[PDB]
Amino acid sequence: REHWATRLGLILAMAGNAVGLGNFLRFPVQAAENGGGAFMIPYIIAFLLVGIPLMWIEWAMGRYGGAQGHGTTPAIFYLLWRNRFAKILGVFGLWIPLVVAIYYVYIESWTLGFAIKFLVGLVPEPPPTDPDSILRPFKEFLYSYIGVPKGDEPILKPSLFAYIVFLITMFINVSILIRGISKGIERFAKIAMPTLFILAVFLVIRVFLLETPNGTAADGLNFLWTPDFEKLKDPGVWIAAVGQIFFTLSLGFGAIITYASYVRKDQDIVLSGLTAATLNEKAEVILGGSISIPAAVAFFGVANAVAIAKAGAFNLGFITLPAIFSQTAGGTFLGFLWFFLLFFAGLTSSIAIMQPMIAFLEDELKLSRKHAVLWTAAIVFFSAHLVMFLNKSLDEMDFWAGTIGVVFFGLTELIIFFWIFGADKAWEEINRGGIIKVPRIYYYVMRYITPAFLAVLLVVWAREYIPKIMEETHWTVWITRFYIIGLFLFLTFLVFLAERRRNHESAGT
Amino acid sequence: REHWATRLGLILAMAGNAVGLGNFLRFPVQAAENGGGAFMIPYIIAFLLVGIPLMWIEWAMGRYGGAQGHGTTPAIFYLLWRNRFAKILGVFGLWIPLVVAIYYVYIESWTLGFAIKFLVGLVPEPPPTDPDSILRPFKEFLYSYIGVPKGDEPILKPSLFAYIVFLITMFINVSILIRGISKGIERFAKIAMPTLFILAVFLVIRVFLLETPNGTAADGLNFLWTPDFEKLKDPGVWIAAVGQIFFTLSLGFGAIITYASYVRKDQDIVLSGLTAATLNEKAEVILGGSISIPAAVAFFGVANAVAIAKAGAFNLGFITLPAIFSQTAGGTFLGFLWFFLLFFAGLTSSIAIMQPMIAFLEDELKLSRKHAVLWTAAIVFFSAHLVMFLNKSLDEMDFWAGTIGVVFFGLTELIIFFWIFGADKAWEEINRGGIIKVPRIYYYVMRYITPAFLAVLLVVWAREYIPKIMEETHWTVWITRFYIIGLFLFLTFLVFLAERRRNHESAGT
Ligand SMILES: CCCCCCCCO[C@@H]1O[C@H](CO)[C@@H](O)[C@H](O)[C@H]1O
Ligand SMILES: CCCCCCCCO[C@@H]1O[C@H](CO)[C@@H](O)[C@H](O)[C@H]1O
Ligand SMILES: CCCCCCCCO[C@@H]1O[C@H](CO)[C@@H](O)[C@H](O)[C@H]1O
Ligand SMILES: CCCCCCCCO[C@@H]1O[C@H](CO)[C@@H](O)[C@H](O)[C@H]1O
Ligand SMILES: CCCCCCCCO[C@@H]1O[C@H](CO)[C@@H](O)[C@H](O)[C@H]1O
Ligand SMILES: CCCCCCCCO[C@@H]1O[C@H](CO)[C@@H](O)[C@H](O)[C@H]1O
Ligand SMILES: CCCCCCCCO[C@@H]1O[C@H](CO)[C@@H](O)[C@H](O)[C@H]1O
Ligand SMILES: CCCCCCCCO[C@@H]1O[C@H](CO)[C@@H](O)[C@H](O)[C@H]1O
Ligand SMILES: CCCCCCCCO[C@@H]1O[C@H](CO)[C@@H](O)[C@H](O)[C@H]1O
Ligand SMILES: CCCCCCCCO[C@@H]1O[C@H](CO)[C@@H](O)[C@H](O)[C@H]1O
Ligand SMILES: CCCCCCCCO[C@H]1O[C@H](CO)[C@@H](O)[C@H](O)[C@@H]1O
Ligand SMILES: CCCCCCCCO[C@H]1O[C@H](CO)[C@@H](O)[C@H](O)[C@@H]1O
Ligand SMILES: CC(C)C[C@H](N)C(=O)O
Ligand SMILES: CC(C)C[C@H](N)C(=O)O
Ligand code: NA
Ligand code: NA
Ligand code: NA
Ligand code: NA
């Protein structure tokens, strides 16, 4: 089996798995939509009661499986729980990252296409004070790129440029993955993460210099970092905060598990896992939090900044920020640096969510790395046509896989490891080889608090939120539901084939 | 490998593969849409220049593959042509029958549901002369069963009854297939084919007694059997005639090939193949041709009968015929006998188009028959939800797979066997073990006339017909296109896995 070559390499690869579009695009919107500082308390609490303990659990399950030649959850769950149902529940750790990759790589491709156009100055020209006259050209630019519907049909028509850039983006992901863990992912992380850090710091500095008649970047920071204890009682804020913690730490996607499956059996995961998690959190709250929101607030004031965030997932990052930058000297190049940052952040994460399918095909069906990578890319490339052409298909996938799925899977993996496999065995396994030990209090957090917290969350979710989504959506949501259900049945079939191959092989040995 | 147990068994199974909904539903519409007797000359000529020679070619390829343990075209094409492209072209002999099964089993399920309701008398009551007042209730009955759209959305809503009957129909197909070739398919054919023949003869007799002020059944027969040489120049009629010959003989679906793969290496296929073909043709032109058209013509006259046929694929068989029968004593029970006939005709054919996927999984991935059958049923059952809920998805599948695909595949398989593998080797292989020999003239028909006839047909098709279909259809056709393209990529992946398994096994031996 492959292994990470260096400690630093492992840490930066895991940090790049985590630090992605979630930090720079998703966090500012979630924080802004949910009251700024009012979001931050539930967020910090979720980091402590869910993010940290689940991070250690995933690293441990991955390292444990990897020791036996298995890096993905159909096999790993079965190692932990010798029951046919383990293998079926395990399919979610292939299905979730595959479905997420299907829309995530497309959005990543937009950042590359925007980086290219901004570099070469093929960008809109706003009319030199009316905000709408400045924003409209950037709205039109995004809408033309991805091809937002102008009529009643729920159909998208991406530009030829966007489509070619998607192909290029898939090629770049493949170019890294095909080189494998140490020579591909790890080597890339050592270049990409320092680059990303420097680009991000530069942009934070530039933004901190923004001052207009409507405010300063300081006003943005104050909005994000001033607590509002009256919102601690709002379930929606808690649900938002927990969903963001899963998404941002890559938990419940089978991706931390698969990366950790390349950690040597004896090598520490306590300090390493904690470090990757903290690095992500710094990039999220310090870097991601200090760019878009303070820029928007400086230019528009808090109330308008908030309304922009609520407006769409992509408004702040693909329309508003470049529009604001366009009002400054060098602003087109600053937009380039922003999209380049987003691109490296996305790329280091998308390789992490394609690696589970790759590991499964290699570990369980015994494909060569080359074939595993190319068939993985083929399935993602083909499937992404749904997200490219069907309006809101992206939203539907992000909901089932990237929102509900990961929380369900996090609870599942915790129950399997800490309850079924055995709490003391799990605890022992997490701590084995640790440079530090997990604080004792965390045993009770993992065994009782985390699953209870998650279980309640899912119930309140399913009761007061999802009913309005199974009944109040356009009929075309069933196109995406049908297809991703088919993907699950497909992956289940592959796990069935893997077991038949194993059986036929055991009979020959 | 399994083998057919008896000569008669083999013949009736192959006759039941052929004799299906194509004979009783499709033929009358095609003949009626294309001038009755004006259709019949091109049809008879296509039977001689395409149907017969391709039937022998498929039996021979199947028997040839079966001798080496292979019943499906990815492997068989590769045996005939040791080239990677053979295996890829061979995927069409899994994809075509799977896609066709996906809509064909659903339509078969309607015949079972109608048989049930007609048996129990849960049928419409027409108002005792106005044709519309008699037809409308039967139109409404079909539209409620399958759930035709009442608004603008291209969405179907089948009744709960129709949905349960689809499940039952899948179960019945599975119940036969899971017993295998000799104890399942062959044993069923020995019961079903005589039943079908007797039901069909009874219905022809009953219809021949129809006389109304608008005409007699005799008028229907005269319309169908009176040549119109002025239509011999119409390409559309030729295209219609050839498409019907493929569909009705099950050619180009990989299904005759797979059945023939269970014929012993030494056993005759010349007389056997010819007999199955002739039996189908009698059931088509004598039985299928003498029921619906003469009934409709007797009641409505030729011009109206023709207009009914042009009205929809299903109007004549599911609306008009039962409406006409309802005007006669015992007419509800006669409708039962009609739908029961259609059900046995469909069932004996649907098992034939599921068997290729089953044979592939058994032969190439080494699944047990039980697992091959159940996974096949699962994929068909799941996929059929597209045809059940998306208006016109059925039409799109029937076009790409059941219309264009089979003609393309017929030409492909002929080129592979007779040109690449070798005309003299092919000829030798067809005739080996024959109780009779193929007439010498047919060597030149197979080598030159058949491929030339097909090639011209496809060109004239692609030039003067398909352009109007890639540009003049509703956007939702891309939902079905996307999904069936995904099915091809899926089957290609399975052929890739089969080759890797074979490779790993050869290295162990
Ligand atoms: C591998 C799956 C292929 C399914 C069909 C893909 C069709 C892609 O179609 C392409 O779309 C681009 C973006 O809109 C257009 O700019 C191009 O002109 C068009 O060829
Ligand atoms: C990495 C570089 C990818 C380049 C893809 C080129 C796509 C060209 O796309 C074409 O460009 C023309 C000129 O702008 C436009 O007028 C056309 O509408 C557009 O189709
Ligand atoms: C379910 C996902 C399948 C999407 C396949 C879409 C195939 C491409 O479809 C083509 O796209 C072009 C670019 O928009 C259009 O200009 C063409 O009119 C259209 O034929
Ligand atoms: C919500 C959970 C937050 C846990 C923060 C743990 C901080 C560390 O807590 C420390 O743990 C050590 C090891 O068990 C003990 O020896 C120390 O006395 C204790 O203070
Ligand atoms: C491609 C096949 C599409 C068929 C699905 C048709 C079912 C439409 O049903 C609709 O589904 C929506 C989404 O759940 C709901 O919001 C609506 O209440 C419901 O009427
Ligand atoms: C295996 C793939 C499952 C995808 C969702 C299938 C949903 C079937 O839904 C069923 O449809 C029937 C027919 O309209 C309705 O009568 C039933 O009330 C409904 O439960
Ligand atoms: C093989 C027998 C299958 C029987 C399936 C029963 C489906 C019942 O279906 C129900 O039947 C009621 C009474 O007719 C109707 O009023 C309801 O609308 C319908 O949903
Ligand atoms: C692409 C094929 C997917 C189709 C899945 C449809 C899932 C079922 O959808 C359900 O169907 C019922 C019966 O029509 C409706 O009454 C319900 O409103 C709808 O939710
Ligand atoms: C369109 C093709 C129709 C072919 C009909 C063939 C009828 C049989 O033709 C016969 O074939 C025998 C064997 O070669 C010869 O010995 C006979 O002389 C010949 O008449
Ligand atoms: C589920 C994803 C659907 C996206 C497909 C959108 C492409 C629509 O494009 C349309 O396609 C039709 C069918 O070929 C053609 O008749 C029209 O000319 C064309 O505009
Ligand atoms: C940042 C990592 C991926 C995030 C995917 C977010 C998916 C949901 O985001 C959605 O939010 C807005 C809601 O009005 C819409 O305007 C957008 O179309 C978008 O699909
Ligand atoms: C008989 C074996 C399967 C035949 C499938 C036929 C598919 C095309 O048949 C179509 O023809 C008519 C055209 O107006 C439509 O009314 C129907 O909805 C039907 O889909
Ligand atoms: C799905 C994950 C790889 C996403 C990543 N953690 C991010 O924040 O963008
Ligand atoms: C697809 C084939 C099995 C159809 C069959 N030959 C019929 O006439 O209905
Ligand atoms: Na992150
Ligand atoms: Na990343
Ligand atoms: Na037939
Ligand atoms: Na049949």
Identify the residue whose tokens are 């199947």: B62
Query: A490 and B490: CB-CB below 8 Å?
Result: yes
Q: What end-to-end distance do the CA atoms of chain B give, in Å? A: 21
Helical ranges in B209-288 per DSSP H: 217-225, 235-249, 255-260, 270-282
Pocket around ligand 14 at a 6 A CB cut-off = B 17-18, 20-23, 100, 247-248, 250, 253, 255, 349, 352-353
- Tell me the C-alpha distance between A285 and A355, whole Å: 27
Flag whether residue A365 sits within 8 Å of chain B, measured between CB atoms: yes
Query: Which of B365, B391, B491, B500 to probe the A interface (max A CBs under 10 A)?
Result: B500
Contact of A474 with chain B, judged by CB distance below 8 Å, is answered with: no
Inter-chain touch B486–A482, beta carbons under 8 Å: no
A234 burial (CB, 10 Å; 0-12 / 13-18 / 19+) is middle
* Long-range CB contacts (within 8 A, 24+) of A236-240: A236/A34, A237/A34, A237/A35, A237/A38, A237/A39, A237/A42, A238/A42, A238/A46, A238/A457, A239/A457, A239/A460, A239/A461, A239/A465, A240/A30, A240/A33, A240/A34, A240/A39, A240/A42
Specify binding-site residues of A.
84
A3 touches B: beta carbon within 8 Å: no
Calculate how close chain A gets to B485, using CA atoms only, in Å: 9
Chain A residue closest to B383 (CA)? A486
Question: With contacts defined as CB-CB under 8 Å, which chain B residues touch A478?
Answer: 389
Q: Which residues pair with B390 in a beta bridge?
A: B155
B156 CA: nearest ligand 8 atom: 14
CA angle B153, B154, B156 (to 5 degrees): 105
The answer to whether the CB of A57 is under 6 A from ligand 13 is no
Question: Which residues, other chains included, contact B175 with Cβ-Cβ below 8 Å and sequence gap of 6+?
Answer: none
Calculate the CA B48 to chain-centre distance.
Answer: 19
Please give the distance of CA B500 from its chain centroid, rounded to a whole number: 33
CB A60 within 8 A of CB A269: yes
Alpha helices in A391-435 (DSSP H): 393-399, 406-414, 423-431
Spell out which residues of chain A touch residue B496, defining contact as CB-CB under 8 Å: 371, 375
CA A44 to chain centre: 18
Token code pair at residue A492: 């289940």
Question: What is the distance of C-alpha B69 from the center of its chain?
Answer: 26
Is residue B509 less than 8 Å (CB to CB) from chain A? no
Contacts of A389 in chain B (CB under 8 A): 478
Compute the 3-state secondary structure of chain A and give helix, strand, coil in percent, each to the nearest 5.
Answer: 80, 0, 20
Report the chain B residue with the minimal C-alpha distance to residue A483: B483
> Which residues of chain B does A153 touch, with a Cβ-Cβ cutoff of 8 Å?
475
- Comparing CA positions, the residue from A23, A442, A486, A282 lying closest to residue B489 is A486
Residue B210, φ and ψ in degrees, nearest 5: -70, 130
> CA B441, CA B432: separation in Å to the nearest integer?
17
Strands A215-216 and B211-212: unpaired
Cα A246 from Cα A255, distance rounded (Å)? 12
The nearest alpha carbon in chain A to B508 belongs to: A508
Which residue type, as a one-letter code, is found at position B448? Y
Report the distance separating Cα A356 and Cα A162, nearest Å: 27
Angle made by CA atoms A381, A263, A102, in degrees to the nearest 5: 15
Which of A367, A385, A508 is facing B482, going by the closest CB pair? A385
Interrupted after residues, chain B (C–N over 2.5 Å): 128
Environment of ion ligand 15 (residues, CB < 5 A)? A 18, 22-23, 248, 280
Domain boundaries, chain B: 1-509
Q: Which of A493, A502, A503, A506 to mutate to test the interface with B (most CBs of B within 10 A)?
A: A493
**Six token digits for residue B391:** 């208006």
Cα(B432)–Cα(B428) distance, integer angstroms: 6
Q: CA-to-CA distance for B448 and B464, rounded, in angstroms?
A: 24
CA distance A297 to A215: 7
**In the beta sheet, which residues pair with residue A211?**
A216
Q: Pull the structure tokens for residue A468.
A: 């309005």
Cβ neighbours, 10 Å, residue A456: 12
Q: B501 and A500: CB-CB below 8 Å?
A: no
C-alpha A161 to ligand 2 mean position (Å): 6
- The DSSP element (H or E) to which A235 belongs, if any, is helix A235-249
Q: Give the C-alpha distances (Å, rounded to integers) separating A173 from A342, A350, A388, B358.
A: 15, 7, 18, 36
Residue B314 forms contact with A (CB below 8 Å): no
Residues 6+ apart with CB under 8 A from B344: B192, B195, B196, B199
H-helix segments, B120-159: 131-146
Task: Count how many pairs of residues, chain A against chain B, have C-beta atoms within 8 Å.
Answer: 51
Task: Give me A118's structure tokens.
Answer: 């901004």
Non-local CB neighbours of B73 within 8 Å, separated by 6+ positions: B89, B90, B91, B92, B93, B94, B254, B257, B356, B413
User: Token pair of A106, please?
Assistant: 């497309």
Residue among A361, A480, A489 with most chain B CBs within 10 A, to mutate:
A489
Q: Classify each residue of B284-303 as buried b or exposed e, where b means 16 or more C-beta atoms within 10 Å of its C-beta.
A: bbebbbbbbbbbbbbbbbbe
Segment (H or E) for A463: helix A450-464
What are the CB-based long-range contacts (under 8 Å, 24+) for A152-157?
A153/B475, A154/A390, A154/A391, A154/A392, A154/A474, A154/A476, A155/A389, A155/A390, A155/A391, A155/B475, A156/A388, A156/A389, A156/A390, A156/A391, A157/A389
d(CA B386, CA B483): 9
CB A213 within 8 A of CB A300: no
- Decide: A253 in ligand 13 pocket, CB within 6 A: yes
Q: Would an 8 Å CB–CB cutoff place B489 in contact with chain A? A: yes
- Report d(CA B272, CA A358) in Å as an integer: 49
As annotated, the binding site of A for phosphocholine includes 84
Is residue A457 within 8 Å of A466, Cβ to Cβ?
Answer: no
Ligand 5 atom 15, closest CA: A471
DSSP state of A326: T
- 3-state SS, residue B285: helix
Instruction: Decide if B1 touches A, using CB distance below 8 A.
Output: no
Q: How many CB atoms lie within 10 A of CB B224?
A: 24
Which amino acid is residue A334, in one-letter code?
L
Distance B268 CA to ligand 13 centre (A): 63
The DSSP-derived string for B359-385 is HHHHHHS---HHHHHHHHHHHHHHHHH
Measured in residues, chain A has a length of 509
Is the Cβ pair A483, B485 closer than 8 Å?
no
Resolution in A: 1.8
Report the alpha-carbon distance of residue B139 to residue B132 in Å, rounded: 10
Distance A156 CA to ligand 3 centre (A): 9
DSSP β-ladder status, A215-216 and B215-216? unpaired
Please name the helix (run of DSSP H) or strand (run of DSSP E) that holds residue B262, with its range, or none.
Answer: none
Task: Locate A380 and state its tokens.
Answer: 């993602």
Ligand 9 near B48 CB (within 6 A): yes
Q: Which experimental technique did the depositors report for determining this structure?
A: X-ray
Rounded to 5 degrees, what are φ and ψ at B215? 155, -170
